Amino acid sequence: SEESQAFQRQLTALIGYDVTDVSNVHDDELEFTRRGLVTPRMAEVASRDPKLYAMHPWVTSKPLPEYLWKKIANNCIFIVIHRSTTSQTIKVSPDDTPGAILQSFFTKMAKDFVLRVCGRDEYLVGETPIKNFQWVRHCLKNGEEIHVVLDTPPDPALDEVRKEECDRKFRVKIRGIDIPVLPRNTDLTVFVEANIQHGQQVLCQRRTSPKPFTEEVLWNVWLEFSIKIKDLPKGALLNLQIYCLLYYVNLLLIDHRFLLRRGEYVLHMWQISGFNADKLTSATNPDKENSMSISILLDNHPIARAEMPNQLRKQLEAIIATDPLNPLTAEDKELLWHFRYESLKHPKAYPKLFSSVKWGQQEIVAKTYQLLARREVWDQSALDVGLTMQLLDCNFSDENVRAIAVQKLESLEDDDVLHYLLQLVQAVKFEPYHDSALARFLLKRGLRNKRIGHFLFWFLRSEIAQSRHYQQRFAVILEAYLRGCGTAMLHDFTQQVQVIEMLQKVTLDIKSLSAEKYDVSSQVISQLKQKLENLQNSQLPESFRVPYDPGLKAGALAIEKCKVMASKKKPLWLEFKCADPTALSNETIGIIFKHGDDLRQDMLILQILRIMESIWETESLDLCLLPYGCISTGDKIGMIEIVKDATTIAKIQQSTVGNTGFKDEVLNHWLKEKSPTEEKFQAAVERFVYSCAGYCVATFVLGIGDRHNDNIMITETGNLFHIDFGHERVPFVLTPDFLFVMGTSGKKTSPHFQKFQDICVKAYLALRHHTNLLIILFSMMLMTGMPQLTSKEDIEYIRDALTVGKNEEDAKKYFLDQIEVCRDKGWTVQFNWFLHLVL
Numbered sequence: 001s002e003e004s005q006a007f008q009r010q011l012t013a014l015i016g017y018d019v020t021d022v023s024n025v026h027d028d029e030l031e032f033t034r035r036g037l038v039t040p041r042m043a044e045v046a047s048r049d050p051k052l053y054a055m056h057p058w059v060t061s062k063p064l065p066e067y068l069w070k071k072i073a074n075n076c077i078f079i080v081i082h083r084s085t086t087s088q089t090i091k092v093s094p095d096d097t098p099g100a101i102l103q104s105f106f107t108k109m110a111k112d113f114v115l116r117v118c119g120r121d122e123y124l125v126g127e128t129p130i131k132n133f134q135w136v137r138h139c140l141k142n143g144e145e146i147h148v149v150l151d152t153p154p155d156p157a158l159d160e161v162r163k164e165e166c167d168r169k170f171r172v173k174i175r176g177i178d179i180p181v182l183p184r185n186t187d188l189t190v191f192v193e194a195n196i197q198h199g200q201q202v203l204c205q206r207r208t209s210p211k212p213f214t215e216e217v218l219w220n221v222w223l224e225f226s227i228k229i230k231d232l233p234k235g236a237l238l239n240l241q242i243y244c245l246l247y248y249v250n251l252l253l254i255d256h257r258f259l260l261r262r263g264e265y266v267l268h269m270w271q272i273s274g275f276n277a278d279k280l281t282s283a284t285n286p287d288k289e290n291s292m293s294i295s296i297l298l299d300n301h302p303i304a305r306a307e308m309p310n311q312l313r314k315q316l317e318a319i320i321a322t323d324p325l326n327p328l329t330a331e332d333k334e335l336l337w338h339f340r341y342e343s344l345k346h347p348k349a350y351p352k353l354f355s356s357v358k359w360g361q362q363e364i365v366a367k368t369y370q371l372l373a374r375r376e377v378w379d380q381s382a383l384d385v386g387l388t389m390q391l392l393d394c395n396f397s398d399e400n401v402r403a404i405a406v407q408k409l410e411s412l413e414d415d416d417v418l419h420y421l422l423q424l425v426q427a428v429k430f431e432p433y434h435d436s437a438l439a440r441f442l443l444k445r446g447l448r449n450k451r452i453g454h455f456l457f458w459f460l461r462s463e464i465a466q467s468r469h470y471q472q473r474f475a476v477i478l479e480a481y482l483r484g485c486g487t488a489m490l491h492d493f494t495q496q497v498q499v500i501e502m503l504q505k506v507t508l509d510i511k512s513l514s515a516e517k518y519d520v521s522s523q524v525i526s527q528l529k530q531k532l533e534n535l536q537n538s539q540l541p542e543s544f545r546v547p548y549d550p551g552l553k554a555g556a557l558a559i560e561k562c563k564v565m566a567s568k569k570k571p572l573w574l575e576f577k578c579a580d581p582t583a584l585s586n587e588t589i590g591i592i593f594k595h596g597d598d599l600r601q602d603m604l605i606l607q608i609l610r611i612m613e614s615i616w617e618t619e620s621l622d623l624c625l626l627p628y629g630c631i632s633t634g635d636k637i638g639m640i641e642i643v644k645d646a647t648t649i650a651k652i653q654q655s656t657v658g659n660t661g662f663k664d665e666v667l668n669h670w671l672k673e674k675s676p677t678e679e680k681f682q683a684a685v686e687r688f689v690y691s692c693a694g695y696c697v698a699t700f701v702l703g704i705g706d707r708h709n710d711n712i713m714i715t716e717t718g719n720l721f722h723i724d725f726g727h728e729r730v731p732f733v734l735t736p737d738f739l740f741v742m743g744t745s746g747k748k749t750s751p752h753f754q755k756f757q758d759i760c761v762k763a764y765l766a767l768r769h770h771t772n773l774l775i776i777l778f779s780m781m782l783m784t785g786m787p788q789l790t791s792k793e794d795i796e797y798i799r800d801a802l803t804v805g806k807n808e809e810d811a812k813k814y815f816l817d818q819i820e821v822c823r824d825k826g827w828t829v830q831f832n833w834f835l836h837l838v839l
């Protein structure tokens with residue numbers, strides 16, 4: 001239709017990819033998926049209530065942390081209901097409801113309405129305690145006053161959606177392979193390797209005679225396998241690889257309609273470079289112009305009580321209580337299997353139990369599917385994200401195992417889906433098929449909530465504009481989401497995508513007009529400013545929503561405050577004005593555009609940091625972390641949130657001494673001066689101690705605590721925070737300037753440094769209580785976030801770091817040891833840091 005085809009062009013521009021393309025495809029799994037996601041989209045949109053969907057109340061059922069009550073020791077909240085002039089400050093109770101609250105206002109005013117926060121697209125509605133709104137806790141945690149404005153409920157009419165209406169051994173013939181360009185140094189040979197895979201696990205492997213690596217190499221040789229056609233499990237993967245490893249490609253032997261792949265195929269392959277999630281994609285290489293290829297032929301159809309002793313039961317248990325990174329063995333597996341009804345009564349044993357299943361045999365898989373049939377213990381157990389996330393990684397390809405995994409996620413409330421959305425989304429790369437429990441689950445949660453949906457949009461978009469391996473799949477999941485969020489949501493995303501395109505065009509140009517040789521010369525300096533105008537004209541929207549912070553709505557770009565950070569690279573530093581007039585602060589909005597870093601690795605790292613707070617919180621601890629917003633929007637490019645009143649530590653040093661040259665007291669001077677009243681400098685020391693320990697533990701477990709001062713920042717208010725995360729040693733950073741702030745010197749004691757270790761070990765062991773969770777996220781971050789890593793050696797770092805095994809009491813000491821190693825280096829390495837880091 002003249003406009004229907006027009007709408008698709010819209011969704012296409014938003015999505016950054018053309019789902020309506022069938023150029024790079026060899027079947028119809030995608031279309032079937034769009035076809036298939038239509039249902040899930042429909043059930044949810046219909047189900048979602050406009051009354052709450054249009055205001056996305058953001059709340060939690062978790063208990064208000066123990067470190068957030070001193071604020072309210074009078075069981076009285078100081079909400080400050082605004083309006084237009086009369087800002088009456090009502091008093092409510094930590095239990096009152098946005099309804100009751102509206103009462104203590106109209107009850108205090110005499111002779112519909114909703115209370116959204118001032119300067120933010122956040123409403124405080126819904127039958128939920130005023131203490132269960134993340135905002136109220138945000139205000140309580142920052143000493144800020146809980147404000148709010150009396151305004152009418154948003155016309156839900158806006159959340160309007162456009163109208164919607166054999167028992168033979170497996171065989172495989174390798175015809176040959178081809179590549180346009182040949183002339184490559186060596187005159188070596190090459191062979192093809194066909195592997196039948198299921199969950200990383202190879203179930204068979206066949207090769208080919210080493211023929212010379214010429215422009216074209218035909219083999220016309222059948223590759224007979226041992227596995228029988230009735231044993232190939234759903235999810236199985238024919239992994240073709242070229243060795244001389246330089247090229248790989250995959251092809252599911254069992255389609256989406258439960259049929260066995262049969263026919264001629266010309267697969268364009270991915271190039272390798274010298275484990276990670278890309279080697280797993282069922283996608284073919286889009287660039288059929290200069291990429292290796294392989295012709296194969298497929299032609300061969302539906303789909304297919306005593307009690308453990310005591311000593312052995314003592315053996316099974318020792319297996320169960322082991323980290324995920326600890327491999328298994330022929331015996332452990334046979335043990336876990338033969339007693340599959342025993343190990344079944346233990347949820348934590350599911351990952352290991354399913355790793356001992358011989359998927360390459362119909363009979364065994366058949367039994368396995370019968371094991372799952374009864375999930376009393378699992379379905380009844382408390383939700384364990386660690387364990388759940390484990391059944392969604394690269395090791396589980398059976399949809400039924402993975403399926404129960406999503407079954408527990410179903411039990412997650414928004415606030416928790418926000419804490420994991422990113423990894424949940426990265427986990428879709430492990431799914432063997434496009435349409436899946438996990439996708440269906442992400443898609444629904446997106447539609448049911450505008451916050452999750454906003455973040456789903458960018459997380460998926462991040463993958464589509466950068467991942468050839470997984471764009472088609474993500475794009476298809478995105479389009480499905482876009483057709484259910486609403487007309488408003490669309491208007492928003494559109495405005496957002498436009499602003500970034502241009503600001504990204506500006507970003508790359510400036511980087512060009514500026515040589516490696518540090519400059520920020522008059523010229524480029526005059527250029528950026530000149531550039532920031534050709535856009536502020538009309539094209540660049542008068543306003544737009546902030547991708548890393550959905551509430552905030554940026555307006556005009558304050559050219560007068562925009563610049564270009566030094567850095568080898570040339571990140572851009574932009575600032576806008578809040579498009580909301582009801583704001584009660586002068587604070588503009590600072591976003592940092594940059595090119596050069598894999599801004600995805602950053603995202604993941606900040607994601608983990610928010611998961612380390614959440615943990616610390618449940619254990620009543622607060623290490624004041626500042627995981628700033630960051631959204632990767634393309635290959636080596638994205639945006640960064642700008643924390644107000646923050647300075648690099650290095651600059652804090654060279655702000656008293658010299659350049660090339662470190663006064664241990666430089667920091668304590670900055671804090672006292674950059675602070676009005678002493679009552680405040682006291683605070684600053686407080687927030688500095690907590691957040692300081694915070695990045696100490698966190699950065700350590702992650703193995704990213706050895707960084708040059710230039711990547712460490714602090715605020716005039718006391719909060720410190722690391723930055724830059726895209727990839728004499730040391731644990732972390734506890735330099736004399738910090739140590740000094742706490743009040744200490746070479747080997748000493750203090751009311752603060754004592755607090756420092758006091759807060760650390762407590763937060764550290766707290767993390768140790770989530771060893772398995774941390775390991776799994778960690779292990780998923782490498783597989784989808786970093787190049788290609790050994791499925792052992794690289795993940796193993798997290799295992800030694802978190803010191804799995806050791807008794808708490810020891811670890812309690814282990815940390816401190818690492819702490820003393822600090823003094824041992826004083827300014828050693830920090831002074832050294834100019835060279836480089838490796839290994």
Ligand SMILES: O=C1NC(=O)/C(=C/c2ccc3nccnc3c2)S1
Pocket residue numbers: 565567571592594597602628640641642643644646723724725726
């Ligand atoms: O990877 C990276 N490359 C860069 O240039 C970075 C700079 C940066 C990051 C966060 C900030 N937050 C508040 C203030 N200033 C900031 C500066 S991070």
